């Protein structure tokens, strides 16, 4: 079993000795090829540094694959990872930070990926939680951030099969007129699609709105949640945002996901096709022979199961069976873990949401017809 180079990019604070337990730990004899691990830490946030040390991973060492993770949520470096990745024409997936955060409009020639659900799949999880919310009052207010008409018609798509009359109040394309236009808000849930910095001033106009008070709900996305440790004081109190795990899912376990998905990505290809790619000639010198890449391997690499859980990356790059966590902010000034959502499947801590005006009317009974 040949050991092919794999670039593992550890950004920020990380455990290298433990990274040997997340990389060097073992190799699976079920495969006709072996992993070859490359682990270093370059903490620079400049993309030309990603080009530097990555093009060094190709230049000095010889890598058939690569992996990286981010120490922050800035996705410009991810856009880099796309551009230079396809420039290298090799797949990779962000395991942490903005690297794990996907961006819109994945490059066609790019075989790279990331760890996370689709914004579509994200909203789907938001719907499973809507079931967990057991609330019929919804609405749509969101900005020009990516997926605008997309996630619009995607909301209309998620409720497009809805038989129940659960009310989605209105659609709002966000842009003084903030609260002036937004005052029509009715439904108990507060849900929006925009950036997190966009959510800072949006949340400022939300405190300016005051409609966020108790007896109402607030929904936000995984990336919209951003850093759990980062709480803008203007966001809704204990706001409910499910996300991919910022705690539970191991980033070194994500390293097992990367190197693993690389190996299994070589499983059937090396098996039948018996084709593994060579390392790129050079960042300068790989331009001509670059025609030697084809779409079969990654296409063959599509269907996969990581640690038994489906590892297939979506044609858009998301995970076939992504592991998402039901989550919310708390009133303790911390993000409260509200559960986990595995595809349609989901879990939570309690049988009720976090919960003048009366609470509710029990009025217990038993059905007696008529």
């Amino acid at each position: 079993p040949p050991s092919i180079g794999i670039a593992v990019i550890l950004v920020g604070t990380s455990d290298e000795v433990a990274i040997k337990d997340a990389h060097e730990k073992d190799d699976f004899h079920h495969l006709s090829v072996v992993p070859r691990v490359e682990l270093v830490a370059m903490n620079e946030t400049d993309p030309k540094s990603i080009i530097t040390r990555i093009c060094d991973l190709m230049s000095d060492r010889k890598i058939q694959g690569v992996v990286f993770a981010d120490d922050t949520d800035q996705e410009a470096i991810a856009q880099i990872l796309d551009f230079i990745s396809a420039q290298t024409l090799t797949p990779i997936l962000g395991i942490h930070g903005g690297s794990s955060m996907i961006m819109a409009d994945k490059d066609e020639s790019s075989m790279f990926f990331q760890f996370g659900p689709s914004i579509e799949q994200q909203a789907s999880v938001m719907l499973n939680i809507m079931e967990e919310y057991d609330w019929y009052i919804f609405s749509i207010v969101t900005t020009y951030f990516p997926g605008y008409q997309d996630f619009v018609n995607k909301i209309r798509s998620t409720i497009e099969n809805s038989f129940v009359g659960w009310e989605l109040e209105e659609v709002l394309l966000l842009d003084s007129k903030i609260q002036n236009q937004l005052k029509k808000l009715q439904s108990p849930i507060i849900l929006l699609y925009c950036t997190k910095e966009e959510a800072t001033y949006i949340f400022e106009v939300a405190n300016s709105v005051g409609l966020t008070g108790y007896g109402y709900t607030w929904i936000v996305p995984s990336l919209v949640a951003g850093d759990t440790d980062t709480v803008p004081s203007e966001f809704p109190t204990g706001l409910i945002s499910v996300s991919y795990d910022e705690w539970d899912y191991g980033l070194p376990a994500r390293v097992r996901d990367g190197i693993a998905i690389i190996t299994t990505a070589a499983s059937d290809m090396l098996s039948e096709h018996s084709f593994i790619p060579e390392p790129k000639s050079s960042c300068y010198n790989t331009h001509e022979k670059r025609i030697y890449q084809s779409n079969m391997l990654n296409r063959y690499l599509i269907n996969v199961t990581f640690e038994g859980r489906d590892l297939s990356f979506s044609e858009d790059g998301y995970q076939m069976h992504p592991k998402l966590v039901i989550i919310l902010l708390n009133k303790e000034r911390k993000w409260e873990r509200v559960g986990k959502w595995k595809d349609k499947s989901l879990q939570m801590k309690y049988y009720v949401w976090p919960r003048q005006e009366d609470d509710h009317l029990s009025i217990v009974t038993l059905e007696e017809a008529p």
Binding site: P47, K48, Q79, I84
Partner: protein
């Protein structure tokens, strides 16, 4: 007070004339400049970009396309730096998501066949049959075709109805056998064949276009110069319909007048204050200064009445506005200029522009078929 502005292109004589641009530019308070060549390796391309440009620390940089191809711009976004484009008539560059910042010197093909949608009165033909290659930029292209199309319905809210559409077909890129496309074309009663493609794209288009005589006399096949450019003249069909974007040859003089507007932009930077000078070192500067969005509200807001290339304009996306395309009628295995739009200005030729069929006579493609199916 030297203000640094960037540029990129293939032509080195254009780099000489770019240094020349910094001079009269400095005349129209001071100017700075730096340049970088074109690297076949994209890694080398944007790499040496970050070498020069970051060190250059210009707000925006011109770029050509010696033929997506803006990974150096992908570096500008790392600093959220503004970007000044020229070349591509493809609107993948006009996608705002990937690169939040790019400024095209002139409008791409984005309005190209849409100028024919303006010609809906010109040819007075209300039946629109849509052919295309299958690609992203093409997908958005026909999407815009629907927009301006659907735009008429909004205008139709409020002369014998309006410009009705027909089947939209995006041919899978690099089509061996277009027999599916032309096959669909046979059933069409309309004579209006609307498509646009790259050269090797257009291969089966113009080549196989008459293979079934799907262009058969009276069938109007209209397109742009970007469709007519390249090998399109080799197999070029008889009496084909199309135009040529005004000044669509080269971006050199477009770089001249482009600096013409650039001085207006930095002049607004002089008309502004508290702007963030771009940081020098790429490595070591981890935060994009807010001047990028300032460069959006500025370089975007920049409008020059008339430049060396004519009126200097920009769309809402900031490329050009009211831009012209020169109508060129196919004759003698060549395209003879039949006029040009303002975007709105109908210019009839001196000679009658002849259809692929007999002369210029305007057929009606709405002709019904006796066979009536149920």
């Amino acid at each position: 007070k030297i203000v640094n502005i960037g540029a990129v292109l293939s032509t080195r004589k254009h780099e000489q004339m770019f240094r020349e641009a910094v001079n009269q530019a400095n005349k129209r308070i001071q100017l700075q400049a730096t340049s970088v060549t074109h690297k076949p390796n994209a890694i080398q391309m944007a790499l040496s970009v970050c070498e020069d440009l970051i060190s250059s620390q210009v707000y925006a940089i011109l770029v050509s396309h010696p033929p997506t191809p803006t990974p150096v711009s992908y570096t500008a976004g790392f600093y959220r730096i503004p970007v000044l484009g020229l070349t591509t008539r493809m609107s993948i560059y006009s996608d705002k998501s990937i690169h939040l910042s790019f400024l095209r010197t002139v409008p791409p093909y984005s309005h190209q066949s849409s100028v024919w949608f303006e010609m809906m009165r010109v040819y007075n033909w209300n039946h629109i049959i849509l052919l295309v290659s299958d690609d992203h930029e093409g997908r958005a292209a026909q999407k815009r075709l629907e927009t301006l199309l659907e735009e008429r319905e909004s205008k139709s809210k409020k002369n014998k109805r309006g410009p009705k559409a027909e089947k939209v077909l995006q041919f899978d890129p690099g089509t061996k056998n277009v027999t599916a496309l032309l096959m669909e074309a046979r059933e069409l009663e309309a004579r209006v064949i609307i498509l646009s493609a790259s050269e090797d794209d257009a291969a089966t288009v113009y080549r196989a276009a008459a293979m079934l005589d799907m262009t058969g006399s009276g069938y109007v096949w209209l397109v742009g110069e970007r469709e007519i450019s390249g090998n399109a003249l080799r197999y070029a069909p008889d009496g084909i319909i199309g135009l040529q974007l005004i000044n669509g040859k080269n971006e050199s003089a477009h770089i001249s007048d482009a600096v013409g507007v650039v001085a207006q932009a930095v002049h607004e930077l002089l008309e502004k204050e508290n702007i963030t000078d771009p940081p020098r070192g790429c490595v070591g500067n981890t935060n994009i200064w807010k001047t990028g969005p300032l460069f959006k509200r500025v370089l975007m807001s920049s409008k020059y009445a008339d430049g060396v290339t004519g009126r200097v304009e920009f769309n809402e996306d900031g490329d050009r506005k009211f831009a012209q395309y020169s109508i060129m009628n196919l004759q003698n295995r060549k395209l003879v200029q039949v006029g040009i739009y303002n975007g709105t200005h109908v210019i009839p030729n001196d000679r009658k522009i002849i259809w692929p069929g007999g002369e210029t006579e305007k057929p009606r493609g709405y002709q019904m078929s006796t066979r009536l199916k149920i």
